Ligand binder design. Structure first.
Ligand SMILES: CC(=O)N[C@H]1[C@H](O[C@H]2[C@@H](O)[C@@H](CO)O[C@@H](O[C@H]3[C@H](O)[C@@H](O)[C@H](O)O[C@@H]3CO)[C@@H]2O)O[C@H](CO)[C@@H](O)[C@@H]1O[C@@H]1O[C@H](CO)[C@H](O)[C@H](O)[C@H]1O
Length: 138
């Protein structure tokens, strides 16, 4: 569950995802993979505060929230894509006060402003799809 945890990954964030808390995800994008998702979630089957979905087909890093049954407006702007076929990556995800702060391989990837009212309503990390994880710190 910390080292080589298989997918689908399900990890409880003890307490809530409080401001200042940083989450580490090291992984490997398989050459014959299409898509994987990192979901910061309210419970095991509630709302997704941050959905990070790299898609190998169109080389896109989609961010969105699933709130009260609906997907919001997608955020896709990046200056680099670390999730290419056969690439190892090092993700650092800090829950800020007003926004998530996400770095890839030591370089800023994106910020994502909080849509959910939770600084700490977020208590579940779900990682699923075409990804091989070497290390998840929670
Ligand atoms: C079909 C699918 O892949 N479902 C996924 C789910 O994915 C969607 C999200 O990635 C959102 C984020 O904005 O995008 C959706 O597609 C957009 C597309 O990007 C647009 O360009 C287009 O105009 O609109 C569509 C529709 O909004 C994706 O469909 O993400 C969740 C969370 O990771 C997955 O759970 C879900 O997988 C399915 O889960 C189901 C149970 O809830 C079923 O088990 C199903 O088998 C899974 O494939």
């Amino acid at each position: 569950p910390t080292f080589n945890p298989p997918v689908p990954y399900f990890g409880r964030l003890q307490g809530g995802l409080t401001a200042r808390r940083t989450i580490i995800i090291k992984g490997y994008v398989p050459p014959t993979g299409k898509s994987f998702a990192i979901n910061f979630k309210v419970g095991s089957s509630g709302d997704i505060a941050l959905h990070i979905n790299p898609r190998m087909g169109n080389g896109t890093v989609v961010r969105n929230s699933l709130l009260n049954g609906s997907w919001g407006s997608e955020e896709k702007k990046i200056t680099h894509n670390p999730f290419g076929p056969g690439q190892f990556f090092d993700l650092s995800i800090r829950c800020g006060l007003d926004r998530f702060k996400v770095y890839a391989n030591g370089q800023h990837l994106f910020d994502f402003a909080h849509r959910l009212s939770a600084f700490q309503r977020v208590d579940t990390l779900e990682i699923q799809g075409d990804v091989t994880l070497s290390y998840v710190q929670i």
